[PDB]
Amino acid sequence: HWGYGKHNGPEHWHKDFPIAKGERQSPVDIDTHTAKYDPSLKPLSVSYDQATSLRILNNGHAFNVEFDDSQDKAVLKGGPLDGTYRLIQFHFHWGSLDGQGSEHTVDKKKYAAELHLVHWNTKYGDFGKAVQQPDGLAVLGIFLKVGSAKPGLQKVVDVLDSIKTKGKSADFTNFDPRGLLPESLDYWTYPGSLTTPPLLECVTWIVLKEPISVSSEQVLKFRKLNFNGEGEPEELMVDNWRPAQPLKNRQIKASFK
Ligand SMILES: CCOC(=O)[C@@H]1CS/C(=N\S(N)(=O)=O)N1
Ligand SMILES: [Zn+2]
Numbered sequence: 001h002w003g004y005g006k007h008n009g010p011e012h013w014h015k016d017f018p019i020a021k022g023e024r025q026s027p028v029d030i031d032t033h034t035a036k037y038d039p040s041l042k043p044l045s046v047s048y049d050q051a052t053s054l055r056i057l058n059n060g061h062a063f064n065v066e067f068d069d070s071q072d073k074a075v076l077k078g079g080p081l082d083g084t085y086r087l088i089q090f091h092f093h094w095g096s097l098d099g100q101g102s103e104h105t106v107d108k109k110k111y112a113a114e115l116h117l118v119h120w121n122t123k124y125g126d127f128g129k130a131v132q133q134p135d136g137l138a139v140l141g142i143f144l145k146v147g148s149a150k151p152g153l154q155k156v157v158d159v160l161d162s163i164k165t166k167g168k169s170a171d172f173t174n175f176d177p178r179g180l181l182p183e184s185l186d187y188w189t190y191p192g193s194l195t196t197p198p199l200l201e202c203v204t205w206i207v208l209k210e211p212i213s214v215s216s217e218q219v220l221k222f223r224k225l226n227f228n229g230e231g232e233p234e235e236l237m238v239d240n241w242r243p244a245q246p247l248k249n250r251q252i253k254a255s256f257k
Pocket of ligand 1 (some may be wrong): 116131159193195196197240
């Protein structure tokens with residue numbers, strides 16, 4: 001199926017998913033000089049105090065931390081958004097080396113990794129209906145640079161040994177995603193897509209300006225995961241990022257002056 005290798009990676013996805021060559025694909029390079037401050041934006045409201053994490057899953061592409069989204073427990077509102085978007089999962093994309101791994105870039109700079117907090121618009125009732133709508137999802141993207149450790153990441157790191165291979169999962173209750181955020185909520189926003197197949201053009205992207213710092217040891221443990229299943233030849237889960245796509249007829253707006 002689709003993946004990140006030479007034979008099944010981003011250059012191939014368009015054959016099964018022709019929207020890969022669409023008009024609002026993600027990620028993109030964020031040209032900071034060209035992005036424009038938008039006074040009509042609002043501050044982001046990130047309300048995660050009642051978040052209920054459930055489980056962590058190696059899906060063969062990344063690992064997802066899943067949340068109970070049966071009620072408004074962890075939601076994103078404000079900023080460019082109309083209404084309320086419920087957190088369903090978060091995951092990362094990362095590199096084989098510290099100089100690559102992010103999906104979005106900032107003036108062509110690649111970060112070591114990128115966190116995606118995925119939310120769906122409650123006006124559509126369920127995630128599957130939301131990803132049939134142009135305003136169905138909001139993804140909060142956060143860059144990771146290597147430096148000091150991120151304390152709020154360490155519980156994630158420590159469970160990765162138990163989900164090494166594709167299809168493995170583990171309990172992951174009582175995790176607080178507030179501990180993954182930087183201090184500032186300043187952001188860039190643009191309309192885009194999922195960055196994995198099916199590449200659906202349903203996402204309002206909200207990319208924070210301030211990266212979080214994680215330690216070399218934390219990201220090293222991401223790179224010990226496997227793309228393959230148990231008992232199969234080991235292929236390290238690294239370089240699970242899609243490169244920047246054409247901006248086409250889009251403007252990136254900034255929340256900050
Ligand atoms: C429709 C099924 O869900 C997906 O295919 C997932 C949901 S989040 C994502 N890509 S990303 N990296 O843009 O968050 N793909
Ligand atoms: Zn992602």
